[PDB]
Short mmCIF file of C-alpha atoms in Angstrom, two decimals:
data_model
loop_
_atom_site.label_atom_id
_atom_site.label_comp_id
_atom_site.label_asym_id
_atom_site.label_seq_id
_atom_site.Cartn_x
_atom_site.Cartn_y
_atom_site.Cartn_z
CA UNK X 1 -46.63 11.13 0.21
CA UNK X 2 -50.17 10.41 -1.17
CA UNK X 3 -48.48 10.03 -4.59
CA UNK X 4 -45.88 7.29 -3.75
CA UNK X 5 -48.93 5.76 -1.81
CA UNK X 6 -51.29 5.66 -4.93
CA UNK X 7 -48.49 4.15 -6.99
CA UNK X 8 -47.40 1.52 -4.56
CA UNK X 9 -51.14 0.46 -4.25
CA UNK X 10 -51.27 0.39 -8.00
CA UNK X 11 -48.74 -2.18 -8.34
CA UNK X 12 -49.88 -4.68 -6.28
CA UNK X 13 -49.45 -3.70 -2.81
CA UNK X 14 -52.87 -4.12 -1.86
CA UNK X 15 -54.22 -6.18 1.16
CA UNK X 16 -56.56 -9.37 0.62
CA UNK X 17 -60.35 -8.04 0.65
CA UNK X 18 -62.00 -8.27 3.92
CA UNK X 19 -65.71 -7.86 4.52
CA UNK X 20 -66.79 -4.39 5.74
CA UNK X 21 -68.79 -4.41 8.96
CA UNK X 22 -69.35 -1.18 10.35
CA UNK X 23 -71.29 1.75 8.37
CA UNK X 24 -69.05 4.57 6.97
CA UNK X 25 -69.67 8.17 6.75
CA UNK X 26 -68.53 9.20 3.35
CA UNK X 27 -69.44 12.49 3.31
CA UNK X 28 -71.16 15.04 5.80
CA UNK X 29 -74.63 13.19 5.03
CA UNK X 30 -73.66 10.29 2.67
CA UNK X 31 -73.01 6.85 4.42
CA UNK X 32 -72.15 3.41 2.98
CA UNK X 33 -73.28 0.13 4.49
CA UNK X 34 -74.18 -3.44 4.10
CA UNK X 35 -77.66 -5.31 4.59
CA UNK X 36 -77.29 -5.51 8.39
CA UNK X 37 -76.55 -1.45 8.66
CA UNK X 38 -79.73 -1.15 6.81
CA UNK X 39 -81.63 -3.25 9.40
CA UNK X 40 -79.92 -1.46 12.01
CA UNK X 41 -80.56 2.02 10.25
CA UNK X 42 -83.93 2.80 12.51
CA UNK X 43 -81.84 2.88 15.69
CA UNK X 44 -78.69 4.16 14.25
CA UNK X 45 -76.90 7.22 16.19
CA UNK X 46 -77.54 8.82 12.90
CA UNK X 47 -81.16 10.12 11.88
CA UNK X 48 -81.44 8.83 8.44
CA UNK X 49 -83.94 10.57 6.20
CA UNK X 50 -83.56 7.82 3.26
CA UNK X 51 -82.21 4.70 2.69
CA UNK X 52 -81.01 3.81 -0.82
CA UNK X 53 -81.42 0.06 -1.06
CA UNK X 54 -79.33 -1.43 -4.05
CA UNK X 55 -80.33 -4.96 -3.44
CA UNK X 56 -83.14 -7.02 -5.47
CA UNK X 57 -85.37 -7.34 -2.56
CA UNK X 58 -87.89 -4.66 -1.74
CA UNK X 59 -87.95 -4.85 1.78
CA UNK X 60 -89.61 -2.39 4.53
CA UNK X 61 -88.83 -0.75 7.92
CA UNK X 62 -92.43 -0.46 8.75
CA UNK X 63 -91.60 0.70 12.40
CA UNK X 64 -89.36 3.82 11.23
CA UNK X 65 -90.40 7.07 9.24
CA UNK X 66 -87.34 6.23 6.74
CA UNK X 67 -87.84 6.67 3.34
CA UNK X 68 -86.52 3.45 1.30
CA UNK X 69 -85.68 4.02 -2.34
CA UNK X 70 -85.35 0.74 -4.30
CA UNK X 71 -83.00 0.55 -6.93
CA UNK X 72 -82.69 -3.40 -7.78
CA UNK X 73 -79.15 -4.26 -9.14
CA UNK X 74 -77.62 -7.59 -9.24
CA UNK X 75 -74.06 -8.03 -8.10
CA UNK X 76 -72.66 -9.56 -11.10
CA UNK X 77 -70.24 -8.89 -14.51
CA UNK X 78 -72.91 -8.72 -16.69
CA UNK X 79 -75.18 -5.83 -15.41
CA UNK X 80 -75.03 -2.20 -16.19
CA UNK X 81 -75.05 -0.18 -13.39
CA UNK X 82 -73.84 3.03 -15.15
CA UNK X 83 -77.43 3.69 -16.48
CA UNK X 84 -78.30 4.90 -12.79
CA UNK X 85 -75.02 6.79 -12.22
CA UNK X 86 -76.44 10.48 -13.19
CA UNK X 87 -79.77 10.11 -11.09
CA UNK X 88 -77.91 8.43 -8.15
CA UNK X 89 -75.28 10.99 -7.85
CA UNK X 90 -77.86 13.76 -8.38
CA UNK X 91 -80.03 12.48 -5.29
CA UNK X 92 -76.86 12.05 -3.27
CA UNK X 93 -75.71 15.55 -3.92
CA UNK X 94 -79.14 16.86 -2.89
CA UNK X 95 -79.15 14.77 0.39
CA UNK X 96 -75.79 16.51 1.29
CA UNK X 97 -77.04 20.06 0.07
CA UNK X 98 -80.20 19.63 2.23
CA UNK X 99 -78.67 17.76 5.24
CA UNK X 100 -80.73 14.71 5.19
CA UNK X 101 -78.83 11.78 6.12
CA UNK X 102 -78.83 8.63 3.53
CA UNK X 103 -77.44 5.32 3.85
CA UNK X 104 -76.46 3.67 0.51
CA UNK X 105 -76.42 -0.22 1.02
CA UNK X 106 -76.06 -3.54 -0.85
CA UNK X 107 -75.88 -7.00 0.55
CA UNK X 108 -72.27 -6.93 1.31
CA UNK X 109 -71.68 -3.28 1.38
CA UNK X 110 -68.75 -3.73 -1.23
CA UNK X 111 -69.96 -3.74 -4.86
CA UNK X 112 -73.43 -2.16 -5.95
CA UNK X 113 -72.83 0.27 -3.19
CA UNK X 114 -69.48 0.77 -3.20
CA UNK X 115 -69.76 1.72 -6.89
CA UNK X 116 -72.65 4.20 -6.37
CA UNK X 117 -70.50 5.86 -3.68
CA UNK X 118 -67.26 6.02 -5.94
CA UNK X 119 -69.60 7.48 -8.58
CA UNK X 120 -70.83 10.11 -6.40
CA UNK X 121 -67.22 11.12 -5.14
CA UNK X 122 -66.39 11.30 -8.82
CA UNK X 123 -68.97 13.34 -9.60
CA UNK X 124 -68.32 15.84 -6.89
CA UNK X 125 -64.74 16.22 -7.85
CA UNK X 126 -64.00 19.34 -9.99
CA UNK X 127 -60.48 19.93 -8.73
CA UNK X 128 -58.47 17.01 -9.28
CA UNK X 129 -57.10 14.93 -12.39
CA UNK X 130 -59.97 12.29 -12.82
CA UNK X 131 -57.22 9.47 -13.07
CA UNK X 132 -55.48 10.56 -9.98
CA UNK X 133 -58.75 10.95 -8.01
CA UNK X 134 -60.22 7.68 -8.90
CA UNK X 135 -56.96 5.88 -7.70
CA UNK X 136 -57.04 7.80 -4.33
CA UNK X 137 -60.65 7.25 -3.71
CA UNK X 138 -60.58 3.75 -4.72
CA UNK X 139 -57.52 3.03 -2.39
CA UNK X 140 -58.22 5.14 0.49
CA UNK X 141 -61.85 3.88 0.74
CA UNK X 142 -60.61 0.08 0.33
CA UNK X 143 -58.16 0.54 2.90
CA UNK X 144 -60.87 1.95 5.47
CA UNK X 145 -63.64 -0.47 4.56
CA UNK X 146 -61.46 -3.54 3.78
CA UNK X 147 -63.20 -4.50 0.25
CA UNK X 148 -64.52 -1.74 -2.02
CA UNK X 149 -65.69 -2.33 -5.40
CA UNK X 150 -63.91 -5.56 -5.84
CA UNK X 151 -66.34 -6.20 -8.90
CA UNK X 152 -64.17 -5.41 -12.04
CA UNK X 153 -67.12 -4.74 -14.17
CA UNK X 154 -68.14 -2.03 -12.07
CA UNK X 155 -64.86 -0.42 -11.59
CA UNK X 156 -64.66 -0.60 -15.76
CA UNK X 157 -67.99 1.27 -15.90
CA UNK X 158 -66.72 3.92 -13.39
CA UNK X 159 -63.42 4.37 -15.25
CA UNK X 160 -65.40 4.96 -18.61
CA UNK X 161 -68.05 7.37 -17.18
CA UNK X 162 -65.56 9.47 -15.18
CA UNK X 163 -61.97 8.80 -16.32
CA UNK X 164 -62.06 7.96 -19.91
CA UNK M 1 -57.74 0.72 -24.36
CA UNK M 2 -54.11 0.81 -22.60
CA UNK M 3 -55.55 3.57 -20.32
CA UNK M 4 -58.63 1.25 -19.24
CA UNK M 5 -55.91 -1.70 -18.88
CA UNK M 6 -53.87 0.22 -16.55
CA UNK M 7 -56.59 1.66 -14.06
CA UNK M 8 -58.03 -1.78 -13.67
CA UNK M 9 -54.60 -3.25 -13.23
CA UNK M 10 -54.02 -0.49 -10.66
CA UNK M 11 -57.42 -1.12 -8.52
CA UNK M 12 -56.65 -4.75 -7.85
CA UNK M 13 -57.06 -6.70 -11.35
CA UNK M 14 -53.82 -8.50 -11.08
CA UNK M 15 -52.96 -12.14 -11.27
CA UNK M 16 -51.18 -13.94 -8.26
CA UNK M 17 -47.54 -14.16 -8.98
CA UNK M 18 -46.03 -16.96 -10.93
CA UNK M 19 -42.46 -17.52 -11.22
CA UNK M 20 -40.69 -16.72 -14.47
CA UNK M 21 -39.16 -19.59 -16.36
CA UNK M 22 -37.93 -18.29 -19.87
CA UNK M 23 -35.65 -15.30 -20.62
CA UNK M 24 -37.45 -12.29 -21.98
CA UNK M 25 -36.22 -10.03 -24.43
CA UNK M 26 -36.82 -6.47 -23.22
CA UNK M 27 -35.12 -4.34 -26.18
CA UNK M 28 -33.04 -5.29 -29.11
CA UNK M 29 -30.11 -6.23 -26.87
CA UNK M 30 -31.23 -6.35 -23.30
CA UNK M 31 -32.59 -9.47 -21.91
CA UNK M 32 -33.93 -10.50 -18.43
CA UNK M 33 -33.80 -13.82 -16.72
CA UNK M 34 -33.29 -15.86 -13.58
CA UNK M 35 -30.34 -18.11 -12.79
CA UNK M 36 -31.14 -20.97 -14.83
CA UNK M 37 -31.14 -18.61 -17.72
CA UNK M 38 -27.61 -17.36 -16.84
CA UNK M 39 -26.23 -20.85 -16.70
CA UNK M 40 -27.74 -21.30 -20.11
CA UNK M 41 -26.44 -18.28 -21.59
CA UNK M 42 -23.62 -19.55 -23.38
CA UNK M 43 -25.51 -22.07 -25.28
CA UNK M 44 -28.49 -19.40 -25.88
CA UNK M 45 -29.75 -18.71 -29.41
CA UNK M 46 -28.49 -15.22 -28.42
CA UNK M 47 -24.90 -14.34 -28.53
CA UNK M 48 -24.54 -12.67 -25.35
CA UNK M 49 -21.30 -10.51 -24.69
CA UNK M 50 -22.29 -9.64 -21.18
CA UNK M 51 -24.17 -11.00 -18.40
CA UNK M 52 -25.12 -8.56 -15.26
CA UNK M 53 -25.28 -10.90 -12.44
CA UNK M 54 -27.19 -9.29 -9.60
CA UNK M 55 -26.84 -12.19 -7.21
CA UNK M 56 -24.82 -12.29 -4.07
CA UNK M 57 -22.55 -15.25 -5.63
CA UNK M 58 -19.48 -14.52 -7.83
CA UNK M 59 -20.06 -17.51 -10.45
CA UNK M 60 -17.80 -17.86 -13.48
CA UNK M 61 -18.73 -19.57 -17.08
CA UNK M 62 -15.15 -20.70 -17.68
CA UNK M 63 -16.11 -22.42 -20.96
CA UNK M 64 -17.60 -19.39 -22.36
CA UNK M 65 -16.23 -15.72 -23.63
CA UNK M 66 -19.28 -13.85 -21.98
CA UNK M 67 -18.00 -11.03 -19.72
CA UNK M 68 -19.59 -11.53 -16.41
CA UNK M 69 -20.19 -8.29 -14.44
CA UNK M 70 -20.90 -8.88 -10.85
CA UNK M 71 -23.26 -6.38 -8.98
CA UNK M 72 -24.02 -8.19 -5.72
CA UNK M 73 -27.38 -7.27 -4.32
CA UNK M 74 -29.47 -8.88 -1.71
CA UNK M 75 -33.57 -9.33 -2.50
CA UNK M 76 -34.72 -7.76 0.78
CA UNK M 77 -36.67 -4.85 1.99
CA UNK M 78 -33.68 -2.88 3.43
CA UNK M 79 -31.10 -2.83 0.60
CA UNK M 80 -30.77 0.36 -1.36
CA UNK M 81 -30.62 -0.53 -5.08
CA UNK M 82 -31.13 3.04 -6.26
CA UNK M 83 -27.28 3.52 -5.48
CA UNK M 84 -26.77 1.72 -8.88
CA UNK M 85 -29.44 2.96 -11.09
CA UNK M 86 -27.59 5.54 -12.89
CA UNK M 87 -24.42 3.32 -13.95
CA UNK M 88 -26.39 0.34 -14.78
CA UNK M 89 -28.98 2.04 -16.95
CA UNK M 90 -25.93 3.73 -18.65
CA UNK M 91 -24.33 0.45 -19.15
CA UNK M 92 -27.57 -1.15 -20.61
CA UNK M 93 -27.90 2.00 -22.87
CA UNK M 94 -24.58 1.40 -24.18
CA UNK M 95 -25.44 -2.17 -24.76
CA UNK M 96 -28.12 -1.24 -26.77
CA UNK M 97 -26.24 1.53 -28.76
CA UNK M 98 -23.62 -0.99 -29.60
CA UNK M 99 -25.58 -3.99 -30.31
CA UNK M 100 -23.82 -5.90 -27.50
CA UNK M 101 -26.69 -8.61 -26.23
CA UNK M 102 -26.60 -8.50 -22.58
CA UNK M 103 -28.47 -10.73 -19.77
CA UNK M 104 -29.84 -8.94 -16.64
CA UNK M 105 -30.36 -11.65 -14.32
CA UNK M 106 -30.78 -12.39 -10.56
CA UNK M 107 -31.84 -15.92 -8.74
CA UNK M 108 -35.67 -15.84 -9.51
CA UNK M 109 -35.67 -13.11 -12.40
CA UNK M 110 -38.20 -11.18 -10.49
CA UNK M 111 -36.83 -8.42 -8.18
CA UNK M 112 -33.17 -7.53 -8.22
CA UNK M 113 -32.98 -7.94 -11.96
CA UNK M 114 -36.71 -6.83 -12.55
CA UNK M 115 -35.97 -3.61 -10.78
CA UNK M 116 -32.75 -2.77 -12.76
CA UNK M 117 -35.06 -3.35 -15.99
CA UNK M 118 -37.71 -1.36 -14.84
CA UNK M 119 -35.24 1.52 -14.03
CA UNK M 120 -33.55 1.05 -17.64
CA UNK M 121 -36.99 1.37 -19.26
CA UNK M 122 -38.00 4.51 -17.08
CA UNK M 123 -34.30 5.91 -17.93
CA UNK M 124 -35.22 5.59 -21.84
CA UNK M 125 -38.61 7.16 -21.50
CA UNK M 126 -38.38 10.68 -22.94
CA UNK M 127 -41.89 10.79 -24.33
CA UNK M 128 -44.64 9.82 -21.78
CA UNK M 129 -45.93 11.07 -18.40
CA UNK M 130 -43.64 9.07 -15.85
CA UNK M 131 -46.49 7.84 -13.69
CA UNK M 132 -48.36 6.55 -16.65
CA UNK M 133 -45.40 5.18 -18.47
CA UNK M 134 -44.42 3.43 -14.84
CA UNK M 135 -47.78 1.98 -14.58
CA UNK M 136 -47.70 0.68 -18.24
CA UNK M 137 -44.27 -0.95 -18.05
CA UNK M 138 -44.97 -2.45 -14.41
CA UNK M 139 -48.16 -4.24 -15.75
CA UNK M 140 -47.08 -5.01 -19.05
CA UNK M 141 -44.09 -6.71 -17.74
CA UNK M 142 -45.58 -8.57 -15.16
CA UNK M 143 -48.21 -9.79 -17.39
CA UNK M 144 -45.73 -11.22 -19.61
CA UNK M 145 -43.42 -12.61 -16.83
CA UNK M 146 -45.79 -13.85 -14.38
CA UNK M 147 -43.97 -12.02 -11.59
CA UNK M 148 -42.11 -8.66 -11.90
CA UNK M 149 -40.72 -6.49 -9.02
CA UNK M 150 -42.73 -7.62 -6.15
CA UNK M 151 -40.49 -6.45 -3.59
CA UNK M 152 -42.33 -3.22 -2.46
CA UNK M 153 -39.00 -1.51 -1.13
CA UNK M 154 -37.59 -1.62 -4.70
CA UNK M 155 -40.75 -0.35 -6.37
CA UNK M 156 -40.81 2.64 -3.95
CA UNK M 157 -36.93 3.39 -5.07
CA UNK M 158 -37.94 3.17 -8.67
CA UNK M 159 -41.11 5.39 -7.95
CA UNK M 160 -38.69 7.99 -5.82
CA UNK M 161 -35.95 7.79 -8.78
CA UNK M 162 -38.02 8.27 -11.83
CA UNK M 163 -41.69 9.59 -10.91
CA UNK M 164 -41.23 11.53 -7.85
#
């Protein structure tokens, strides 16, 4: 079933992109979100230890004890994001090992953040053929979120690192 | 390269569908076309022996010596088309063996005809992993034609027969 699903999605059976609104729990401790979700982090049902801010602006949450890690990226078709895949995925893996909730976010919660979450999931996959796992994670996340790594340059970088 | 191509196409990097206009030579003797292409068959640069008419109407070309084979199908999401895959692909294979040009057509040259051409190409593949070959043929034909088996029920039937 999941296989027929992947092949139909892969041949144009996708919905038009829609903006995510709510935070998504991706793993036990790793969450994916947009800017509003980051602003709402301190009051979230989840007790975040970390927020990974992938936007260009270095904001603060001065009334919170959250540690905000800033990795400034631009959502464009020219930026290398792959230079940070190894260190970001190692950091997210450590958050999961230590049960330290972390919110990975960008402005829209689609491209810079979606790409780091896709990299994390690919990095954690030791079981499945990378090509199949990539299609599965891509489409299942997109169906859940509404839009997920729409930026084709970011998708290309994920494919180069984890599939090719 | 062809691999990176497939994976980007498979994750939403496709163009909006556009109607095919000109006939496409798919193999040495097998061509894919719309209704206008069928009407223009007798005067074509190609000396067709056969036209496979997949539309519901049994037309004639009374001034031509073309043999018109009628397999009436509807382009809808309910029709089994798979019941004819074995006999159609065997017939197309025979046209290629005998160097007898054949035009496979529907009304739009996209769905009923595109699906029989995709089935033919899958049937002729003995070399490549079916999942990869399916994605390659699908996307390469769609890029060439503008639109190619957009009907998701027909795609599902191809996947069931030749991939699963």
